[PDB]
């Protein structure tokens, strides 16, 4: 490998081939794994030179080597990506998107993906410089399978970073302009094109209901549910995030997830061996039990209440807390027949056993749930049987000990419960 000093002596020559040799040497340094000397390359003042090499059309080799070098600089810290942008690289990379050499156009796609991935500001700056039009033009073919696999994966990933950050979210006109192509990629067969396309949809559905609706109006929910039952984990994870985001919106958007058959997949998702899949599936369930009664009923029909009892009985404490939320939402919006069915499935014992947890928020959520359950018992006139049950499993001892607690809202709800029943 060359020294930073030698790379500078060559790039500063007036010999295009001496400059090509040096730029290739710079690329090979930045493409090493151990501590790529990014900061040393920047102090040398080479970025403005690489940016200008992007424009030498009569020397394709120096365009590729400088694009590769700049791609890796822009992959580092926010300060290092800023240096690439401050050098004028953005309009230069957009121009390279139309290069007749595919490997150079691919490299420009990659570099712009790293720039837009920094955050909202650079993402919007890449969009203002007009990158979306030429990007989508690269995917305007009758069949995506005619495109090179790696070419297609870089395009999908870069598009994902143009739909990613928040505060603010990407411009509405940009999202509308990208979605038709994003939906085509969501039906492609490549696992990575699908995973990065599910991450993009995951980002666009993280926000207000106006953003959710725009995605759900393109009819991608059936396809998301299909991917939700995929064998590969990297596809199930973003597919579930998008599904979980969609159910934070209106009850009609939640209903489209139910109609696509999403609840049939949750027996597996709620017993998935991955802690993170189990937690996100439970979180999604908690937002579904917060919907209508006919929607709580559809949770019951699919046999998911026993699975919630199971997750509440044993799982990572964070998955357990999401299940506690799913029960409190279930009990607060459900009918009487639905709340007693919750007791027949055995919710009380694991719900009580979790009152020994060292977290104040879950205690409030559980106690509230118990209040909703007791309120439904008042309606059937069997408040007596339920209280014999909470006592036979040892729950009262916990409730009456919750009296002596630090927080005030716990003390009041706890006392109020032992006084009423």
């Amino acid at each position: 490998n060359w020294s930073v000093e030698d790379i500078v002596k060559g790039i500063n020559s007036n010999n295009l081939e001496s400059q090509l040799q040096a730029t290739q040497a710079a690329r090979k340094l930045l493409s090493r794994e151990k501590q790529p000397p990014i900061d040393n390359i920047i102090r040398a003042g080479l970025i403005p030179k690489f940016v200008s090499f992007l424009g030498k059309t009569d020397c394709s080799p120096i365009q590729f080597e400088s694009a590769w070098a700049l791609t890796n600089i822009a992959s580092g810290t926010s300060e290092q990506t800023k240096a690439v942008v401050d050098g004028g690289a953005i309009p230069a990379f957009i121009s390279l998107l139309a290069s007749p050499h595919a490997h150079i156009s691919e490299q420009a796609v990659w570099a712009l993906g790293n720039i837009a991935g920094d955050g909202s500001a650079f993402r919007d700056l890449v969009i203002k410089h007009g990158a979306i039009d030429p990007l989508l033009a690269l995917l305007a073919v009758p069949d995506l399978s005619t495109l090179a696999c790696g070419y297609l994966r870089n395009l999908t990933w870069t598009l994902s970073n143009l739909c990613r950050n928040k505060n603010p979210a990407p411009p509405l006109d940009a999202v509308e302009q990208i979605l038709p192509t994003l939906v085509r990629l969501l039906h492609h067969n490549d696992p990575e094109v699908l995973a990065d396309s599910c991450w993009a949809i995951s980002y666009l559905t993280d926000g207000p209901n106006e953003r959710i609706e725009m995605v759900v109006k393109k009819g991608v929910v059936p396809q998301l549910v299909k991917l939700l039952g995929a064998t590969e984990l990297p596809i199930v994870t973003p597919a579930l995030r998008a599904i979980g985001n969609i159910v934070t919106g209106t009850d009609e958007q939640t209903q489209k997830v139910i109609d696509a058959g999403a609840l049939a997949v949750f027996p597996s998702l709620l017993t998935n061996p991955k802690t993170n899949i189990q937690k996100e599936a439970t979180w999604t369930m908690s937002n579904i039990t917060a919907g209508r009664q006919d929607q709580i009923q559809q949770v019951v029909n699919h046999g998911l209440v026993p699975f919630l009892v199971g997750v509440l009985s044993k799982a990572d404490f964070k998955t357990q807390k999401e299940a506690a939320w799913a029960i409190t939402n279930y009990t607060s919006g459900g009918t009487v027949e639905q709340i007693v069915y919750l007791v027949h499935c055995g919710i009380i014992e694991p719900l009580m056993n979790l009152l020994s947890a060292k977290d104040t928020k879950i205690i409030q959520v559980i106690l509230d749930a118990i209040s909703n359950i007791f309120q439904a018992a008042e309606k059937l006139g069997e408040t007596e049987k339920l209280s014999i049950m909470i006592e036979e499993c040892g729950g009262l001892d916990k409730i009456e000990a919750l009296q002596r607690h630090e927080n005030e809202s716990v003390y009041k709800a706890s006392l109020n419960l032992i006084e009423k029943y």
């Binding site: 930045l30 493409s31 590769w68 791609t71 992959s75 490299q107 990659w110 790293n114 991935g117």
Partner: peptide
């Protein structure tokens, strides 16, 4: 977020 080419 950001990826290098090695």
């Amino acid at each position: 977020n950001k990826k290098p080419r090695i």
